[PDB]
């Protein structure tokens, strides 16, 4: 008979300490939950004490036992005699925090054992499930426990320590120049100055109307990151096959007309440039492309983890685009699906400590305004994305709407939400002949 | 001389009908720079605002008045805006392209190609 | 009993089929490894066969038996009796690859079960390990199972593989001269130049107001594809019965007046032309028409798959029109229905690697604008169509709205969204007398 | 053949020309989409007492699945509640 | 200049920064 690891002594000590000391409840409150107790009477006692504490009522022996008696739940717990025994047995000079931590650890271990048993039972009786589904199920089961225990890292911090850390960070940024770049280099001077690079562990959202160069801009960023670093760069393309992406990349890097490449009308110099580009790419060998359709966040996260494990770090992750992703459990409501996607992306960004650039799209309502430049509210149906995003960039091109625009070949990257810097608009040159973005050499305002 | 409101509207409609084949607005056989600017501005305004015939005529009259005031005060109209050259000159045959592809395959040793 | 997942018959089939046919070894070797087999004798047999294959020897019955006998391991395998049993029961009608994949699947499930059991055992016996260590151990165990697995077809390939695929595609496109046409030939020079043909795995939308010629243009494209190819061309006519479609097709191909055909007032030359057209069609025999109504995307996909299976592929799929399709589960909301239809059509196009041309309809408000040439925003209530479609063409006939038009007989195909190329207008000549579109011979700007 | 009668929207009477068009079938887009043939009846004397077309009705083909569209004139005898072939000259 | 800026940085680190610091 397997014996699950349960510490009845720790739970009894916690209960006795709470009865004999009501000031420590908060310390217990941040270490254990009601479901963490093995026996049903202990869970019921904790729930009643939580209700009393939230109502302002004392949690002494008489009031707790009486409250259980009034609701008729005293008999299930064990009685006033049992409550008095629990109160009296526990010595006053006890550290409730240690016992609470032991109880907290035991619940995690019990959940792990339950998940292992579920996986084994599912394997023995597949009920038509595939091996891939079982592997995904096991990964999800383990990651659920990991996140269940990955919530203690968030809480209040000391004011003086925060101030000292902020001062140290300011000094360090002014100490190590890097010419204004602290994160992953974007390959553009003005964007680097306004962003200090692409900060690791931050979610980046790129949004625009159709035909604005969103995929083009993302690919230019990816190529710049690959050429200016050594860590691998991963691309998730749910909308294009990898061959078209590579053709676009060849047009951008070799500065050859995309139509010529697509139709094959290339001369000797174009072939030489393409050979040079291929040689550089094969010498570097740090770009990975995944053109699978109907991607799920689990597959994206698993592939990112595998790349980081294989190569010891990821320079940048790119997803195009998140409106094509699916969560099967929440297909009924799109807003819940989007929230789950955003949460999973943020968790992946935190876990791998990498910059993640996810592309998004805007509704037609933006085009109902006289000024079509995007704003934050144009992220309707994706509020969780706007909240969880650490950087938000919108792409705008005036020449798209106006033929006679004076800004032909000029694109605007608008920072609608920046976590660690200022917002503003950056103008760049758009060479659609080469399918590329470049630094703007004209006057800046 | 500058065309009147009716002639300007007729030219704008003709440009709207016949610009579906020209590579760009500057390639249109404009009589003068002022005609190009006025017709293009009216066309873009109509496209972005769905202006009716009367609204188009009013906008044409306003643009003509503004242009006349600008001319009376001087100023020199630059030659459109221009956008890139035409490039060209690709005398490449199939045999040379195939030889280059084979050379690329041999140099990079592509197993799948 | 919790017997581990295994299939002795599949292993026996694999070994016997390898004994009877040695040219299949590669297919077995690419799918199974010696550790995937459950019983020790099967692993030993596969190892000996691998060694024989490596030495360059045949792996038939006698060679394998002699090689085993020389090493004295013939009894461990089971004997020449067991080897002969494997030879006998396995037929020559063997799909060894399917059994190898199945064996692979069983091994994966079994290893998952073993890892789950190990994780549970570790959880029940901490041995002084923290819960963090146990969770790390569980993650490591599941990760080793999932680490790269065997999904190289649906995973992020290396930069080398993607670049090689792109270069091979470039060479294939440059190999056969078609004068800039890579997809299905549309039959019109300017449209071929602007679109490079109808690309496989792409979603193509044709839209216009009623009586503009959507059905006419679609049938003209079908006729051109049938005349300029060899693969079957399938039509899903949810609007008209097939008899009327064939009457229109005869009017288009024979250039005979539609009214004469409809009223039966033909002459000898018209009858001769019709006979010639019928002879050409019966010599070709690659057009299939389905004039059912209210088709769901599932039925369309099933019928297209059946046609491709029976006649070795498809060359074009045509749907007229998507407003007549039905999704019973989503009949309450039209937007969700249109989104599902577009997603299913895109999936079908990508799966069968064929161009799919679907006709759609526009809102009435377009007729209230000063200029009635369609734009993307005119696809109101069908934003998912604009989002998912690879190519969008609008049909515009000026004479429909203006009686005094100078462009009588001239139609415009406006490329509202071209994913892999430029956009603009292509002019064609409309002969409503013969119900046909032809190349525009007038002056071009 | 199934012949179903239908109404149009009132706003049609506020236009300069009151002959029906397809867009005049508001609230009934599916009617326009599904109908094989659509015929509108128009009498000019209903709106104008000065009408030179007294006793003359127009059948306007708004949608024809397998043929042309246009206007056919007939004679209206409201006394007998009848429509008859138009015997006048045809342009 | 830069040297004076870094010197003041170190001075402030000594004056207020403690325990963790940088
Ligand atoms: N008998 C005919 N003679 C000449 N033109 C016709 C005839 N029938 C239809 N057409 C033309 O075909 C065009 C489109 O008809 P059709 O394709 O049936 O409708 P849709 O375009 O809505 O599918 C109309 O603009 C009309 O001018
Ligand atoms: N062959 C081409 N020539 C010129 N411009 C092109 C070509 N192909 C694509 N583009 C431009 O690239 C831009 C971005 O296209 P795309 O990436 O498909 O849309 P999005 O940026 O919304 O994903 C479009 O505005 C289009 O004008
Ligand atoms: Mg895209
Ligand atoms: Mg039709």
The CATH number linked to A59 is 1.10.860.10
Q: Is C211 annotated as a binding residue?
A: yes
8 Å CB contact between C183 and C324: no
CA C10 and chain centroid, separation:
31
Q: Which two tokens stand for residue A36?
A: 């963490």
What does the alpha-carbon distance between residue A339 and residue A336 come to, in Å, rounded to a whole number? Answer: 5
By residue count, chain C amounts to: 445
Size of interface A-C (CB pairs under 8 A): 161
What does the alpha-carbon distance between residue C272 and residue D64 come to, in Å, rounded to a whole number? Answer: 30
Q: CB neighbours of C66 closer than 8 A, spacing ≥ 6?
A: none
| Torsional sign, CA A223, A224, A225, A231 | positive
Q: Which two tokens stand for residue A212?
A: 């604005």
* Pair (A184, A294) in one structural domain: yes
Token look-up 């049992």 returns A82
Would residue C143 count as lying in a domain?
no
Distance from CA of B83 to the nearest CA of C (A): 16
* Pair (A195, A92) in one structural domain: no
CA C404 and chain centroid, separation:
46
What does the alpha-carbon distance between residue B27 and residue A87 come to, in Å, rounded to a whole number? Answer: 94
* Pair (C271, C398) in one structural domain: yes
Measured between beta carbons, the chain A residues lying within 8 angstroms of E12 are 167, 171
Nearest C-alpha in E relative to A163: E17
Give the number of other CB atoms < 10 A from CB of residue A309. Answer: 13
- DSSP secondary structure of C211-239: TSSHHHHHHHHHHHHHHT-SS-EEEEESS
C334-343 contacts, C-beta under 8 A, 24 or more apart: C334/C381, C335/C381, C335/C382, C335/C383, C335/C384, C338/C381, C338/C382, C338/C384, C338/C385, C339/C384, C340/C297, C341/C297, C342/C203, C342/C382, C342/C384, C342/C385, C342/C387, C342/C388, C342/C389, C343/C384, C343/C388
C-alpha triplet D7, D11, D15: angle, nearest 5°:
120
* Pair (A75, A201) in one structural domain: no
- Domain hosting residue A12, numbered range: 1-124
**Whose alpha carbon is nearest atom 24 of ligand 2?**
A211
Q: In degrees rounded to 5, what are phi and psi of residue C389?
A: -70, 135
Would residue A295 count as lying in a domain?
yes
H or E element: which one contains C304?
helix C297-311
What does the alpha-carbon distance between residue A358 and residue A342 come to, in Å, rounded to a whole number? Answer: 10
* Pair (A116, A20) in one structural domain: yes
| Mutation to test the D interface, candidates C214, C320, C334, C364, most D Cβ within 10 Å | C364
What does the alpha-carbon distance between residue A277 and residue A247 come to, in Å, rounded to a whole number? Answer: 12
H or E element: which one contains A322?
none
Residues that constitute the known binding site of D for ATP: 65
Q: Is C129 left (phi over 0), alpha (psi -120 to 50) or beta?
A: beta
The partner residue sitting opposite D23, judged by closest CB among C262, C324, C367, is C367
Query: Cβ C262–D65 below 8 Å, yes or no?
Result: no
Q: In degrees rounded to 5, what are phi and psi of residue C391?
A: -135, 140
Q: CB neighbours of A252 closer than 8 A, spacing ≥ 6?
A: A216, A219, A220, A223, A434, A435, A436
Q: Is B112 left (phi over 0), alpha (psi -120 to 50) or beta?
A: alpha
Q: Which two tokens stand for residue A254?
A: 């070799």
For chain E, helix, strand, coil in percent to 5 are 65, 0, 35
8 Å CB contact between B113 and C164: yes
Kindly state the DSSP code that residue C153 receives in the 8-state scheme: T
For ligand 2, the distance from its centroid to the CA atom of residue A250, given in whole angstroms, is 15
Interface of E with A in 1-22 (CB under 8 A): 5-6, 9, 12-13, 16-22
The partner residue sitting opposite B22, judged by closest CB among C163, C171, C445, is C445
Domain boundary among A97, A124, A151: A124
For ligand 4, the distance from its centroid to the CA atom of residue C210, given in whole angstroms, is 7
Atom of ligand 1 nearest to the CA of C433: 4
- DSSP secondary structure of C274-300: HHHHHHHHHHH--EEEE--SS--HHHH
Would residue C347 count as lying in a domain?
yes
What does the alpha-carbon distance between residue C375 and residue A367 come to, in Å, rounded to a whole number? Answer: 13
What does the alpha-carbon distance between residue E2 and residue D70 come to, in Å, rounded to a whole number? Answer: 87
What does the alpha-carbon distance between residue A198 and residue A192 come to, in Å, rounded to a whole number? Answer: 8
* Pair (A114, A183) in one structural domain: no
Would residue A154 count as lying in a domain?
no
* Pair (C78, C175) in one structural domain: no
CATH number of the domain within which A352 lies? 3.40.50.300
What does the alpha-carbon distance between residue E20 and residue A71 come to, in Å, rounded to a whole number? Answer: 52
Helix (H), strand (E), coil (C) string for A139-163: HHHHHHHHHHCCCCCCCCCCHHHHH
| Mutation to test the B interface, candidates A404, A433, A442, most B Cβ within 10 Å | A404
Cβ-in-10-Å burial (0-12, 13-18, 19+) of C309 comes to exposed
Q: Which two tokens stand for residue A189?
A: 């001077």
In sequence order, the β-bridge partners of residue D73 are: D58
Q: Enumerate chain D positions whose Cβ falls within 8 A of a Cβ in C.
A: 22-23, 26, 29, 32-33, 63, 65-67, 69
Alpha helix locations (H) across chain B? 5-18, 33-49, 53-72, 94-108
Give the number of other CB atoms < 10 A from CB of residue C158. Answer: 14
Q: Which two tokens stand for residue A221?
A: 């960023």
What does the alpha-carbon distance between residue A134 and residue A145 come to, in Å, rounded to a whole number? Answer: 17
What does the alpha-carbon distance between residue B57 and residue B41 come to, in Å, rounded to a whole number? Answer: 13
* Pair (C213, C338) in one structural domain: yes
C-alpha triplet C195, C196, C199: angle, nearest 5°:
90
Token look-up 């064996």 returns C103
Give the number of other CB atoms < 10 A from CB of residue C347. Answer: 17
State which approach was used to obtain the coordinates: cryo-EM
Nearest C-alpha in E relative to A169: E22
Distance from CA of A164 to the nearest CA of E (A): 6
What does the alpha-carbon distance between residue C158 and residue C156 come to, in Å, rounded to a whole number? Answer: 7
Measured between beta carbons, the chain A residues lying within 8 angstroms of B104 are 271, 274-275, 278
Q: CB neighbours of D84 closer than 8 A, spacing ≥ 6?
A: D74, D75, D77
Would residue A158 count as lying in a domain?
no
Q: CB neighbours of A1 closer than 8 A, spacing ≥ 6?
A: none
Q: Do E and A count as touching (3 or more CB pairs closer than 8 A)?
A: yes
The partner residue sitting opposite B21, judged by closest CB among C174, C406, C445, is C445
Q: Which two tokens stand for residue C430?
A: 């409309």
* Pair (A114, A249) in one structural domain: no
Please give all residues whose beta carbon lies within 6 A of any atom in ligand 1, as ranges.
C 210-216, 258-259, 432; D 67-68
Q: Is the CB of A409 under 6 A from ligand 2?
A: no
Atom of ligand 2 nearest to the CA of C420: 8
Out of A207, A209, A211, mutate this one to test ligand 2's pocket (max ligand atoms within 8 Å of CB): namely A211
CA A219 and chain centroid, separation:
21
What does the alpha-carbon distance between residue C416 and residue A12 come to, in Å, rounded to a whole number? Answer: 72
Query: Cβ A364–C377 below 8 Å, yes or no?
Result: yes
Q: CB neighbours of C47 closer than 8 A, spacing ≥ 6?
A: C34
Provide Rg for chain D, Cα atoms. Answer: 14
Cβ-in-10-Å burial (0-12, 13-18, 19+) of B65 comes to exposed
Q: Which two tokens stand for residue C253?
A: 């191909």
| Mutation to test the B interface, candidates C163, C166, C171, C444, most B Cβ within 10 Å | C171
Q: How many domains would you assign to chain A?
A: 2
> For residue A203, which of A223, A183, A187 has the smallest C-alpha distance?
A183
What does the alpha-carbon distance between residue C114 and residue C5 come to, in Å, rounded to a whole number? Answer: 11
What does the alpha-carbon distance between residue C392 and residue C417 come to, in Å, rounded to a whole number? Answer: 5
Measured between beta carbons, the chain C residues lying within 8 angstroms of D70 are none
Kindly state the DSSP code that residue D14 receives in the 8-state scheme: G
What does the alpha-carbon distance between residue C182 and residue C200 come to, in Å, rounded to a whole number? Answer: 9
Distance from CA of B70 to the nearest CA of C (A): 30
Kindly state the DSSP code that residue A176 receives in the 8-state scheme: S
Give the number of other CB atoms < 10 A from CB of residue D10. Answer: 8
8 Å CB contact between A410 and A427: yes
Ion ligand 4 residues within 5 Å by Cβ: C 215
**Whose alpha carbon is nearest atom 17 of ligand 2?**
A215
8 Å CB contact between D88 and D54: no
Token look-up 């734009």 returns C375
Query: Cβ B40–A408 below 8 Å, yes or no?
Result: no
For ligand 1, the distance from its centroid to the CA atom of residue C380, given in whole angstroms, is 24
Measured between beta carbons, the chain A residues lying within 8 angstroms of E17 are 164, 167-168
Kindly state the DSSP code that residue C302 receives in the 8-state scheme: H
- DSSP secondary structure of A251-299: HHHHT--HHHHHHT---HHHHHHHHHHHHHHHHH--EEEE--SS--HHH
8 Å CB contact between A337 and A326: yes
Provide Rg for chain E, Cα atoms. Answer: 9
> For residue C8, which of C97, C80, C93, C106 has the smallest C-alpha distance?
C106
The partner residue sitting opposite D23, judged by closest CB among C240, C262, C364, is C364
Ligand nearest to the CA of A207: 2
Kindly state the DSSP code that residue C373 receives in the 8-state scheme: S
In sequence order, the β-bridge partners of residue A415 are: A393
- DSSP secondary structure of A43-108: HHHHHHHHHHHHTT----HHHHHHHHHHTT-HHHHT-HHHHHHHHHHS-SS--HHHHHHHHHHHHH
* Pair (C248, C373) in one structural domain: yes
> For residue C61, which of C101, C34, C21, C5 has the smallest C-alpha distance?
C21
Domain boundary among A57, A90, A124: A124
Query: Cβ D29–C210 below 8 Å, yes or no?
Result: no
Would residue A114 count as lying in a domain?
yes
> For residue A404, which of B47, C125, C193, C232 has the smallest C-alpha distance?
B47
8 Å CB contact between A31 and A11: no
Token look-up 């325990």 returns E19
C-alpha triplet A334, A337, A343: angle, nearest 5°:
145
* Pair (A73, A174) in one structural domain: no
What does the alpha-carbon distance between residue A416 and residue A419 come to, in Å, rounded to a whole number? Answer: 10
Q: Which two tokens stand for residue C427?
A: 């002019």
Query: Cβ E16–A167 below 8 Å, yes or no?
Result: yes
CA atoms within 13 A on the CB side of A138: 33
CA C282 and chain centroid, separation:
28
8 Å CB contact between D72 and D59: yes
Q: Which two tokens stand for residue C167?
A: 């270069």
Would residue A277 count as lying in a domain?
yes
What does the alpha-carbon distance between residue C26 and residue C100 come to, in Å, rounded to a whole number? Answer: 11
Q: Which two tokens stand for residue B26?
A: 């500057």
C373-382 contacts, C-beta under 8 A, 24 or more apart: C373/C412, C373/C414, C374/C207, C374/C208, C374/C209, C374/C414, C374/C416, C375/C416, C376/A210, C376/C416, C376/C417, C377/A364, C377/A367, C378/C207, C379/C207, C380/A364, C381/C334, C381/C335, C381/C338, C382/C335, C382/C338, C382/C342
Would residue C151 count as lying in a domain?
no
Give the number of other CB atoms < 10 A from CB of residue B48. Answer: 13
* Pair (A285, A364) in one structural domain: yes
In sequence order, the β-bridge partners of residue C356 are: C203, C317
**Whose alpha carbon is nearest atom 21 of ligand 1?**
C213
| Torsional sign, CA D8, D12, D17, D18 | positive
8 Å CB contact between C303 and C317: no
């Amino acid at each position: 008979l397997k014996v699950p690891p349960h510490s009845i002594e720790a739970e009894q000590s916690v209960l006795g300490g709470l009865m004999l000391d009501n000031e420590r409840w908060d310390d217990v409150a941040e270490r254990v939950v009601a479901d963490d107790f093995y026996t049903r009477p202990h869970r019921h006692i904790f729930t009643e004490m939580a209700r009393l504490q939230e109502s302002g009522s004392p949690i002494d022996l008489i009031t707790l036992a009486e409250s259980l008696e009034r609701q008729g739940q005293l008999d299930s717990v064990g009685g006033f005699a049992y409550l008095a025994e629990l109160s009296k047995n526990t010595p006053s000079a006890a550290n409730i925090s240690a016992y609470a931590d032991i109880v907290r650890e035991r619940a995690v271990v019990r959940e792990m054992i339950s998940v292992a048993n579920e996986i084994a039972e599912a394997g023995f009786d597949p009920q038509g499930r595939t091996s891939e589904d079982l592997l995904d199920l096991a990964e999800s089961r383990v990651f659920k426990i990991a996140e269940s225990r990955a919530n203690k890292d968030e809480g209040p911090k000391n004011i003086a320590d925060v101030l000292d850390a902020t001062v140290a960070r300011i000094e360090q940024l002014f100490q190590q120049p890097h010419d204004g770049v602290t994160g992953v280099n974007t390959g553009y001077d003005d964007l680097n100055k306004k962003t200090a690079g692409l900060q690791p562990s931050d979610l980046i959202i790129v949004a625009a109307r159709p035909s604005m160069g969103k995929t083009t801009f993302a690919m230019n960023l990816v190529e710049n990151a690959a050429m200016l670093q050594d860590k691998p760069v991963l691309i998730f393309s749910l909308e294009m096959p990898s061959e078209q992406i590579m053709m676009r990349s060849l047009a951008s890097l070799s500065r050859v007309d995309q139509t010529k490449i697509r139709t094959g009308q290339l001369d000797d110099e174009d072939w030489a440039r393409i050979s040079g580009t291929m040689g550089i790419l094969l010498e570097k060998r740090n770009i990975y492309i995944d053109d699978s359709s109907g991607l799920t966040p689990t597959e994206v996260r698993s592939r990112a983890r595998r790349i980081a494990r294989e190569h010891g770090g990821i320079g940048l992750i790119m997803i195009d685009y998140l409106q094509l992703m699916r969560v099967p459990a929440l297909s009924d409501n799109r807003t819940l699906e989007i929230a789950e996607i955003s949460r999973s992306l943020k968790a992946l960004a935190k876990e791998l400590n990498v910059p993640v650039v996810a592309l998004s799209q805007l509704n037609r309502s933006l085009e109902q305004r006289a000024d079509k430049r995007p704003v934050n509210s144009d992220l309707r149906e994706s509020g969780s994305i706007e909240q969880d995003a650490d950087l938000i960039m919108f792409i705008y091109r005036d020449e798209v709407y106006h033929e006679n625009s004076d800004l032909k070949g000029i694109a605007e990257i608008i920072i609608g939400k920046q976590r660690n810097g200022p917002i503003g608009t950056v103008r760049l040159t758009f060479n659609g002949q080469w399918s590329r973005f470049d630094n703007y050499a004209g006057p800046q305002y | 001389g500058l065309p009147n409101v009716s002639e300007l509207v007729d030219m704008v409609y003709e440009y709207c009908r016949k610009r579906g084949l020209y590579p760009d607005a500057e390639s249109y056989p404009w009589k003068s720079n002022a005609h190009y600017w006025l017709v293009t501005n009216l066309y873009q305004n109509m496209r972005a605002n769905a202006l009716t015939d009367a609204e188009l005529r009013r906008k044409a009259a306003d643009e003509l008045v503004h242009m006349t005031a600008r001319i009376n005060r001087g100023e020199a109209i630059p030659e459109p805006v221009k956008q890139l050259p035409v490039m060209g000159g690709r005398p490449l045959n199939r045999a040379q392209a195939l030889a280059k592809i084979a050379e690329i395959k041999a140099k990079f040793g592509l197993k799948g190609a």
